[PDB]
Structures are given as C-alpha cells and as structure tokens.
Design a protein around this ligand. Structure first.
Ligand SMILES: Nc1ncnc2c1ncn2[C@@H]1O[C@H](COP(=O)(O)OP(=O)(O)O)[C@@H](O)[C@H]1O
Ligand SMILES: [Mg+2]
Lengths: 524, 524, 113, 137
C-alpha cells in the first residue's frame, strides 16, 4: 500500500480541521440546554439527539489525515469516559480548546516542545487545585446524596445505592437487572467479578451498553489456550441441545476456534461468548479454581490429562446471570454449594497463615474477598416496562458517578470547577516565554466548557464566565435555572475523578499533536 | 511487463526525493526528546509513536523509483539493526546525510567514482577512530553495567544478564519467557540454537517481534527435501489430534508442501511451521542427529528406507519451547534423556580424538558446544501482567546491546562518538579534489545524528555541536538532561558495534546510489 | 566597531531596559534580540554557525569581534573594521521606524488580482 | 512589473543553460575547421557568418533567467570586438569555460568571491606572461 505523507503544518493543519469538525459537531450538545444534532439513518427516519457520545460515534471524515485528527481525539475522549463514566464530550471540548491556540502558536513561530511543557504544568497544577476544591463523599448520606442527584432528583434511587455499598461495601460489586414487578429489589448472592473483557465485540447483545448479558448459561473452566475448535464439539453440542447459553474461561482463544464462535453466534445457532482467565501464571491456577468452586464447575487441567472433548455438562459451572464489557467479566449467583464455597474460603484463609509476604498475604486476601465477598444486585421496579427499563438506565448512571464521587469526591459541575481552578493559578509562569503561552492556552482552555454551556443556552459567555470568576469555592452559575450559587448545593456537580480525567486526557492528546511532525496513511 | 526506465539525474533525483521522505519522516523521532509520528490504522484509531523502526516499516511511496530509493535505504538500515540490535534509525539519518550532499556533487559536475572513494576512506578511517574511542565491556561489572543502563537504570536487569553470561558464557545462548509469578528466574536447561530462519513469514505468531514462539510442540527430523505434502498426512494428523503445534527440520520444503502449510496455518486448523537444517552435506548428517538426541526424536533417513508416511509421534522429538526469527532457530529444553544426551557427547568428544584438522576438530567442537553447552533461560518476574510483559521487553533489548557491548566495547551514545571521530580526521585528504569533497560529505554527515537530536529537543544544533567538538574523549552533551559531560559516565552510550554498523551501512547504500546510473521498474 | 558588534554590544547594555507594561518589555526585548541580525547574517554569508560565533562574540567585551574575512576573533578596531557611527545609527532608526508600524497591521486593502 | 526572484543553485543553473546556449552557438565557428551559422532576418535574406560576435548579438532566450546569463556573457564576445575586432568567438569560449568550472566549485562549496580573486590574479599573471611571448610583427 503506497502511503500519503504530510509534515509540519501541512500535517498539523489537516489534523486541526479534522478535530474541529468533531468538536464543533459534538460541542453544541453540552449544556443542560444543549442544541441537537441530526444523525441520518440508512433505513428510515433520521435521528435527532443531544448526546455527544452518540454524535461523536458517528463522526468519520473523508479527508484521511483530517479524519485521523478526529479519530485521535475520539479515542482518548472515549478512554476518558472509559475510566470515569462521563466527560467524553467535555474532554473533546477541552481537547479542541487547547489544540486550537497552541497549534496557532507552534505555527506562529513558537517552540512546540515548550508549549506542551507549559501546558502539562498548568494541568498538573490545576489537577491539584481540583483535589482541594473537591468535597468528600463518604457517609451513606453523601452517597445517597450524590446518587439521588445523578439519578435526577429521584431520592429512591440515591437511597438503594447507599444501601448497596452499605452491604458489600464501597468496593463491593453491585449490578442491576430489570425488576420483575413494581418494587425495587436489592439482594446479595454468591457471585464474583474480575477485570477481563470479551474477546470479540461481536458478542455484545446489549448494543446500547456494549455489554453481554447472559441468562443462567453454563460455565467452562479450562486451563489451556483454545485454538482448535474440535475439543468443544462434545460440550458445544451438549449446550446446543441444553438450550442454554455458555461462557468460557481459560488462557485464551485463537481465531481458529475464536473467529468461528464469533460468527457461530452473530446470527448463529448456539450463541455464546468467552473471556481470558484472571491473573497470570501460578496465580491463575487457584484463581480459576475459586471460580469453579463458586459455580459448581469442573476445572479442566491438561496438567491432569483430562481434555475438553473429555468433558460433559457435569463439568460445567453455573450462575443465574453474567455480564461482560469492553474489559470486565462479572458473574451473578453461582450454583456452588455453600458448603463447598465456604469451605474453600477456610482453605484460603488458612493459607493466608504463611503471611510469608504482604504481597502474598494481600493476594490470597483479595481472592478471599472476591469469593466470600459476594455480589449485590438490584432490580429496578416500575409500573410500565418503559419507565422500567428507563429508570434502570438512570440507576446504572448514578451508580457510576457515585463510585467516582466516593473515589475522588466531587466538585462543581457546570464547567465551574475548571473556571475556578484556572482563575486560581493565574500567575503561574514558565521558563521559556513559549512555556508561559503554553500555560495560558492551557488555562484559558479550561474556560471552554462553561462558556460553551452558556453559549448553548443562548446566554452571554464572557459575562457569565466573568461573574463566576468573581466568586470563589463551588460558587457558580446554574445554566439550567439561570441562577448563580453553590453548584453543589444546587445539585450540579461532577465526580472529582471525571473532571480530572477529562482535562488530563484532553491535555494528553493536545500536546501529542502539538509535537507531531509527520502523518502517514493510504492514498485516496 | 513493460518497464519504465530512468537515467542519471532523472534516476538519481527520484531516488533522492524517495529517500528524503523516509528520512524526514523517520528522523524526527531520534533524540530521547524526539517528536512523534502518526501511523493511520485501517481499522480504528490511528497510532502515535516515536519509534523510527515502526515509522520506517510503514513507509512506501506511490512514485516507483522514489519508492525504490526509500526501500533501498530501509533495507540496509534494517540489516544494520539485524547485525547490531539497533541503529536502524541512525543509519537512516546518516544515509540521508551522505546521499544528500554527495548527490548534489555528482549533479554539480564532480566525479561520482571518486566521491564514493573519498567517502569510504573517511568511513574506513573513522571506523578505526571508533575502535580507539571504544571502551571495553568484559567483566561482569561492565556487563551488568551497560545492561542495567540499556534496561533504563533498572539495576536488577543488568544483573541477571551478567549472571546469565556468567553461566553459559558470553557466547552462551540466553532466552526469555514470561514470568510465572512475581519473581525473576534464571535456569539452565538442555537446549540448542542455530542460524536458520523460517521458510515463511506467514509463520510469525509474534508480529511485533517477527518471530515464532511455539508451545512444547513436537519435532520432526527428516533427511530429504520435502516437496510433496502426502508423507505428512499420517503424522500431520497424529499431531492434529495431538492438539499440539509441530516443528520441522529437513533439507528444505517446496511450496507444494510448503505453500500448503503456510495457508494451513494462516487461519487454519493445525498451526505449524518449519526451517531448513543446519550444516550442508556430510555436516548436516550428525548435525541433525545431535538434535534428535536432545529432543529425543527419531531421524528419518531415506538412506535407511525410512519414509515420512512411515512415522509416528514415537519418532518425533519434543521441547518445552522454541522460537524462530527472520534467520535463526532456537529450541528450549529437549526431552532427550540426559543419559542419551550426555552419552552422545562421549561419542563426539571421542571423535574429536582424530583431530585430523583444526577445522574438523573445531567443527566437532562446535557441535559439542551446542549440545552440551545448554541454553540459559529467564523468566521476567512482575506484579502486573502489563509491567510483566513490558519489563520482559526491556530485557531482551538490553540483552542485545550487551552482546554487542561485549563484542566490540562501547562508546559515547548521543551521536557523540561520531562528532568526535569526525573532528579528529578533519584534515584527511584525497587525490582527486572530487575525493576531498567525498571525504567532507562523509565527515560532515557524521554530525547529522547529534544535530538531529538537539534539533528534536528544540535546542540549537550548530551551538551544541560546536561545544561538543571542543571537548574530547567521551565528553558530550546529554540532550535528555541538557548537561554536557562524560556521556558514558552519564550512562549514555552505544555498543561500539552498532555505531559502526549503522555508519558503514549508511555509507554502503549512499555510494551505491551515487554510482547508480539506471533504474528499471513497472509502469504505473 | 564593525561586524555588527557595536549593536550586539549596545544590546547587552540595555539588558535591563523596561517599559510601562509587559507587552512593551517584550517589545523592547524583541528589538535587542534583532540587533544580532547584522552580525549573524554576515556569519551565515560565510557558511558558519551564526549562533555559535555570536555567542563567543557576546562572551567578549568592548570591541572584541569576529573577523569573517580572517575567520578569527579579535579587536574589530585594531583590525580596521570600522562602521561610520552615523550609518549604524540610521540603519537602526529607519529600520525600526517602519518595522514598528508594520507589525501593527490588522487589516490591509488593495485591488483584486 | 511583478518580479520573479531566484536564489542559489536554481538561479545559477538557469543562468548557465543560458550561457551554454549562446556559447554553443558561437563555438561551432572556431578555427579553420570552423563552421557557419545562419542568422534569420525578417529584413531580407538570412545571414551566414562565422563571426562570433555577429552571432552572440542575435541570441535571446525565452526563459527570463536562462536569458539573463546569455545576455551577460554576450558582452565579453562584444567588448572583445570593440577592443580589436577579432578573437570574439575565442574570448567567448574561455568564459563558457571559466564559468562552467567556477560554478562547479561554488557548487563544491567554495566562497565565490575568492574564486573570483583566484581567477583575477591568475589572469593578471597570464597577461604579463603573454607580453613576454609577444614578439614584434
Ligand atoms: N590553420 C590553423 N590551424 C590551427 N589553428 C588555427 C589555424 N588558423 C587559425 N587558427 C587559430 O584559430 C583561432 C580562432 O579563429 P576564429 O575562429 O576566427 O575565432 P576568433 O573569431 O576568436 O578569431 C585563431 O586565432 C588561431 O589561433
Ligand atoms: Mg577571427
């Protein structure tokens, strides 16, 4: 493939137009009073929406290069949300902010290496400021507090959320399932979770969630890398007539057997999905075992001779539910005998006796947790199935923020936090004057979100911003009501975590580009 | 296929533009403070990186001719790394350097034949200087020294490395495997390695390594050239239901049987691969046998009436691991009985008795080495699987440098070594004035690397350069810290070997072009 | 002293000159910076590091100056490398006089192509 | 009028092609085995001469730059004629010669100005030399 290559500005300029489109298109939907975009559908009526994430999703430019600039931002702005539960848009918004000015600078004659530096500093600093302004969130009060708010006033919501963490703890594993009746339901059942995503997006069966919810399927607990499909035939057929889904866990899965299942499911007979096993080497050993224990499943170790073909349903584990995402698998209610489960615990416990290491003791400990800890579940009750599934949505939302609120507390959410921090370190200087500018850009860029909101609301940016600077603390302007005050008291905040994330990520990519000197791609 | 043909300048000019792109695109990533390039991915988000090798890899121009110019460089610049473990980039940088000037000269009216000559001399000379500047690396001190440095300060690293060579020797065969737990592990086990690369890139299962790692596969020991696939069917199926990979070794493999496997593997059931056997003629005989011994495998000699269809696993050898690269195969832990293995040694050892030649004694000797010498292994220990495989990487890196460091010592690594040597032979003259110029170009070209770094760091090239010329020895400028001093003491060096390699290779190709008068290619 | 040493010299002398506000200080710094132009253009017309010489020249005092013709430093005067004070002064003034304005352009009008 | 400026090598090259054209056109007529050139004329019939300067004058190039170089060398061929009405072709040859080499050396990276001097001196030297050889006719 012969490539097309651009340098310096030629390159940067493309990148800039590329990004702008993305940002100019997704930004108009920021405020609570955001405007809407129309996403043309191939089949049927177009789609109107104010959800940046969706908008962003659809963006792809013809001009490669320009398109790269766009995809580059989207990538990290996504990562932002990935590791915070929101900000996706905001990040993008800042992204532009920085990139724009700083990119003019580089092009103006100033040194790029410094500009980046100056910025990073600004960010670094503001990030602290954020830590300062952040208001803790620890007691079940604060918890239900933030929850009910992020659930949009609905107190009942914030309630359960507090209850939940109040059961399995803050670090406890909580999940949601549509309610069976009109009442909400919080229950704790033998269950577990671990960081390990699916090996194929084509597994997702819940598009809007990018997740894979499975109904009381069987569970496979191998101990080798499954490349060839063969081994499965026995079991894969058992579950075929078993009329139930099936999940897999082992070293990994090569396309030979992998690529096959992917299609085998995407419009196929038996529809299943799998994910690598937690831990590596020696660790995985017990790890998987723990799971077997919990699901009442049999572990297939080749270090025992037993092969896959040499296995029947009697060897599979079971749980009533199980969901996986881009990078995490979590089971619910495993059929493992309490006697068995509880016993295993005893085992581990003892093992922690060795205490021969704080890493080994910490380790064993962690397993103890997963296994004996359990998994809290909720069932969004509701009158109509609409409200039902709708509310359910709002719930999963809140929970996010809440976890986040817990982790890093929260702050003013109208773009306020940023304005604040910026006005703060307004002297902050750098060595090279090219670094000062670097810092300005950075700071001035933080005004972005707020100004944009106001803008989208049809209000005076410069004016609102100004008066917001004036006050202090979490004193801000509620775009939604056009009233200033304590954004937090007014129920307008952002999990400290996300705001940072957003801002860091945007900074990241920005400099990244500001330091880019070449771009390669295919020819039109 | 009708070709398109260009001459003299028409030819050279294309070659030049061609090369430039490659170098202008790859050079910006040189310093420790290099800028980054964006490599557009077909599916998904583009890739940002500062790794020249990667960049280079992607470069391919539309204009054939210009594209040749590029590939020509890439080829030899790769060869450089191939035979030194690094420089890939640097070589390229220099490559340009020379080519640019010398190519102006030719086009200016000066004689090409001399220009080349004048350069080669300059190189030749400078190469020596390097020998002088080179600082030995032999004691386990210097060994763990460089290692840990190249490992990026991490002392534990340089450690094992020195330990390793301290086991099977400097010429010993060392390998790396992921760690099972958190602890690093160094173990010596029956194994072997030899210069013989895969017969198909479509065998690589480790893309970023361009190598093939196979899990305790079976091993075949043929004795003929394998053209037809038939013979395999018995065994090919035995190992197919054996659910294990499989390696092969014989005279060679014609596409008939070759091409098949390649596909049979690239998205196929039984995934395997093979490589030619070491030694040629009489040598290969025993050569392979030794291997049988070690792997405990059976040798299929047609000179025995034994065929391939006539063969079962009982005839296959085995090892816990094995990896092949562009041109080197190496096994890990053969299942052959020490009894056997050690016994074989007795045989050979005796055989050396003849010692009827310093080639024959040397030869039998070498064999002994491989077989009884053993292969040292390492298991990069780590907390996270990330750091794990990451650290694993840095290790293999360092290892390289070290081997080289050993081989030819080391020198100032900020492009320093070159500046030095250049300022040295600054009088050096040639017969034809067209040779003097030849020499200048060469010399002035050696300032390229340093100058580029300074440049990439946003610093004054001309200035730093100057002051570095001033000092002497390994006195240089650390771009990473912006402090001059003893680059070596400051932990900034380059295995004498690579620096030479790089420089020589660049020189090679440069004149090669400067002496090119015609170019043939297909039509657009 | 020629070789554009005089200027580069007076530049160091105003290293502490300041104005009513920051922008203005930059404005000043800008100008002093530019006074190294003559010198290093000369150097550059000799295929030599404009920045390297300039440095060494700035390291010196009085009429220490690089001699482009001889490619060696020394006293510009003893070397008979003299610039009539008047020109040196006019060059700086006239140059600034326009430059100054020029950089305060925000809009420009002219006919169509 | 709007100009078109060219620097260094590009400029030079053009300039040289310009010289060459002229030169090459006047060389042909050098010596006993010298050949003729035909200068067209809207006036009457074309002109056939072996007079170097006659030729020079007629040369004008479309390429503004190639033309410039031509328009310059043209003067040596010229002045040489005002001086002693002969040797014109010859003179030209030397320039063509000098310049070719000269540029090549500038291309070599030498200071042109010294190149100039080296040549100038080399010449002043050459002159006495001749005055030495000159013997009374
Ligand atoms: N028979 C000859 N053999 C060799 N050289 C000759 C002969 N006759 C003349 N020449 C040389 O050729 C020169 C060039 O003559 P010509 O073509 O008229 O050029 P120009 O117009 O410069 O005199 C004379 O000056 C003389 O040196
Ligand atoms: Mg004559």
């Amino acid at each position: 493939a012969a490539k097309d290559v651009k340098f310096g500005n030629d390159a940067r300029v493309k990148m800039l137009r590329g990004v702008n489109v993305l940002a100019d298109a997704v930004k108009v939907t920021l405020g609570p009073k955001g405007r809407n975009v129309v996403l043309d559908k191939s089949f049927g009526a177009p789609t109107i929406t104010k959800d940046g994430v969706s908008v962003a999703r659809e963006i792809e430019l013809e001009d490669k290069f320009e398109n790269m600039g766009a995809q580059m931002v989207k990538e990290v702005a996504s990562k932002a949300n990935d590791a915070a539960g929101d900000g996706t848009t905001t990040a993008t918004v800042l992204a532009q902010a920085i990139i724009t000015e700083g990119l003019k600078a580089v092009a103006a004659g100033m040194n790029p290496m410094d500009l980046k530096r100056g910025i990073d500093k600004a960010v670094t600093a503001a990030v602290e400021e954020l830590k300062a302004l952040s208001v803790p969130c620890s007691d079940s009060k604060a918890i239900a507090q933030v929850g009910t708010i992020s659930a949009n006033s609905d107190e009942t919501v914030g309630k359960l959320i507090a209850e939940a963490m109040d059961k399995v703890g803050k670090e406890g594993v909580i999940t949601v399932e549509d309610g069976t009746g009109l009442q909400d339901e919080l229950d704790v059942v033998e269950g577990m979770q671990f960081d390990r995503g699916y090996l194929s997006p084509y597994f997702i069966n819940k598009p809007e969630t990018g997740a894979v919810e499975l109904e009381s399927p069987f569970i496979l607990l191998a101990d080798k890398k499954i490349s060839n499909i063969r081994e499965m035939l026995p079991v894969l057929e058992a579950v075929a007539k078993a009329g139930k889904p099936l999940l897999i866990i082992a070293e990994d899965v090569e396309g030979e057997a992998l690529a096959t299942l992917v299609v085998n499911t995407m419009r196929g007979i038996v529809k299943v999905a799998a994910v690598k096993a937690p831990g590596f080497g020696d660790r995985r050993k017990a790890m998987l075992q723990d799971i077997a224990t919990l699901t009442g499943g049999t572990v297939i170790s080749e270090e025992i001779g037993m092969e896959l073909e040499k296995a029947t349903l009697e060897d599979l584990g079971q749980a009533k539910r199980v969901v996986i995402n881009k990078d995490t698998t979590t089971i619910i209610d495993g059929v493992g005998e309490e006697a068995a489960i509880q016993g295993r615990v005893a085992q581990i416990r003892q093992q922690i006796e060795e205490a021969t290491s704080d890493y080994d003791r910490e380790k064993l400990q962690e397993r103890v947790a997963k296994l004996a800890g359990g998994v809290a579940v909720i069932k969004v009750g509701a009158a109509t199935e609409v409200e039902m599934k709708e509310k359910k949505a709002r719930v999963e939302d809140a929970l996010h923020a809440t976890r986040a609120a817990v982790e890093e507390g929260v702050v003013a959410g109208g773009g306020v936090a940023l304005i604040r921090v910026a006005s703060k370190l307004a002297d902050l200087r750098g060595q090279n004057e090219d670094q000062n500018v670097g810092i300005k850009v950075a700071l001035r860029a933080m005004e972005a979100p707020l100004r944009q909101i106001v803008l989208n609301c049809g209000e005076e940016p410069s004016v609102v911003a100004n008066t917001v600077k004036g006050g202090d603390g979490n004193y801000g302007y509620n775009a939604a009501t056009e009233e200033y005050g304590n954004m937090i008291d007014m129920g307008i905040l952002d999990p400290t975590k996300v705001t940072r994330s957003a801002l860091q990520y945007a900074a990241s990519v920005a400099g990244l580009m500001i330091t880019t000197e070449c771009m390669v791609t295919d020819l039109p």
